Each structure stands twice: as C-alpha cells, then as structure tokens.
Amino acid sequence: LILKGTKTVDLSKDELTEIIGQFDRVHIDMGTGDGRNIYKLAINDQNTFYIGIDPVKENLFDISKKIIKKPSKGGLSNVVFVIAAAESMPFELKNIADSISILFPWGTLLEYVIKPNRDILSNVADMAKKEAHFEFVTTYSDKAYFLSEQYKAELSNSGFRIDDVKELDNEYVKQFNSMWAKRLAFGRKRSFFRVSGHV
Ligand SMILES: Nc1ncnc2c1ncn2[C@@H]1O[C@H](CSCC[C@H](N)C(=O)O)[C@@H](O)[C@H]1O
Numbered sequence: 001l002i003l004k005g006t007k008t009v010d011l012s013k014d015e016l017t018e019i020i021g022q023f024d025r026v027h028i029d030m031g032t033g034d035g036r037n038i039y040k041l042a043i044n045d046q047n048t049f050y051i052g053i054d055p056v057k058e059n060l061f062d063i064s065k066k067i068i069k070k071p072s073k074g075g076l077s078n079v080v081f082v083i084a085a086a087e088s089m090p091f092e093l094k095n096i097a098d099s100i101s102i103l104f105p106w107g108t109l110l111e112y113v114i115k116p117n118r119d120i121l122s123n124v125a126d127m128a129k130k131e132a133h134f135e136f137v138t139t140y141s142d143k144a145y146f147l148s149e150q151y152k153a154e155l156s157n158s159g160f161r162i163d164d165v166k167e168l169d170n171e172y173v174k175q176f177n178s179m180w181a182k183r184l185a186f187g188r189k190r191s192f193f194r195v196s197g198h199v
Pocket of ligand 1: 030032034056086087104109
C-alpha cells in the first residue's frame with residue numbers, strides 16, 4: 001500500500017523495481033511521520049530513491065499531495081510513502097535499501113529501538129542490502145546505554161552492527177523539517193542519541 005495524494009493504492013514489486021531503476025541508491029525512513037524529513041532529503045539528492053514508511057496515512061496527506069504536483073510546483077519523482085508498520089514485513093521491501101533510518105521515534109517504534117525488540121529490528125534489517133548503512137536517532141526525557149555490550153550484542157543479533165554512538169544537541173535537530181523534530185529542537189534542552197553503523 002502506497003499513497004498517491006490522499007488516495008491509497010497498491011504498488012507491485014515489479015512497479016517498484018522499475019522506479020528504483022532511475023536511481024543509484026535507495027533510502028528507507030521507518031516511522032517517517034509527516035513526510036517533511038524525507039521531502040528535504042529527496043529535494044537535496046536526486047540520485048537516491050526515498051521510501052518513507054508509516055502506519056498513519058492521515059499525517060502524510062499534505063506532503064503526499066505535494067510530491068504529486070508538477071516539479072515546478074514542488075513535485076518530486078524520487079519519493080514514495082508506504083503505509084505499513086515495523087511489524088508488517090512487506091515482502092517488496094526485502095533486500096532493497098542502501099540505507100535505513102529511524103528518526104525521533106515515539107510510541108511502539110521507540111521501544112522497539114530502545115529495548116530493543118530483536119524480532120522487529122530483524123524485520124527492519126531484512127529491508128537492507130548486504131552493504132546497508134543504518135542510523136537510529138532517539139530521545140526520551142527532557143550514551144552509556146547505547147555503548148553497552150548488551151545493547152551492542154542485541155542489535156548485532158538483529159543484523160545491526162553499531163559503529164558509532166554520538167550524543168547530539170537541539171541545534172543539530174533544528175536541521176530537520178518535520179513538525180515533530182521542530183518541537184523537539186525548539187523546546188527544552190534535550191539529549192539526542194544517534195546509533196549508527198552497518199547491516
Ligand atoms: N510500530 C511502528 N511501525 C512503524 N511506525 C511507527 C510504529 N510506531 C510508531 N510509528 C510512527 O513513528 C512516528 C513517530 S513521530 C514522527 C517521527 C518522524 N521520524 C519525525 O522525525 O518526524 C509516528 O508517525 C508513528 O506513526
């Protein structure tokens with residue numbers, strides 16, 4: 001299931017593969033939210049195909065309608081929004097992504113990343129190519145935990161090899177365009193943590 005404007009339609013594996021062809025890279029943003037973050041990445045890189053995934057279609061209507069417009073009016077040819085959850089395991093997305101991100105997750109998705117939930121993270125890893133770079137950026141309250149051997153080993157069992165943990169600040173988050181990220185950036189001082197590496 002993908003969005004075309006405000007309408008949900010089906011995109012097949014063959015149709016997807018065809019679109020991917022005009023691009024050298026594929027990036028997946030899981031729990032993409034309002035689509036503004038992915039919109040900004042896409043407008044800045046026309047040789048990557050961006051796939052934003054979120055179970056809430058309603059919050060994607062604005063940007064989904066925007067990417068459908070003609071290029072002169074803000075349309076884009078390198079973005080698709082898939083309506084699905086981290087639990088969903090859509091077969092079409094298996095072994096497709098050069099990179100995968102989970103940015104500022106909340107609700108169930110946050111706990112899956114933080115706990116972590118090994119099975120769910122495995123579903124996310126299954127969407128990545130052998131190469132695959134990953135990036136999880138989290139915050140809760142407003143580094144030692146993510147650097148721990150236990151967390152490292154649990155991610156490794158899910159297919160994620162941590163190469164770096166970095167503590168980031170509000171200023172860093174100000175770069176993102178989602179309304180959620182802006183709230184996080186503009187509010188109280190908060191610690192943000194990026195756990196990145198390869199699949
Ligand atoms: N189990 C799950 N699978 C996929 N997405 C989920 C999820 N649980 C929550 N989410 C999504 O995660 C989002 C958290 S808020 C938006 C975060 C977004 N990446 C941003 O930076 O703006 C919500 O849109 C929510 O629908």
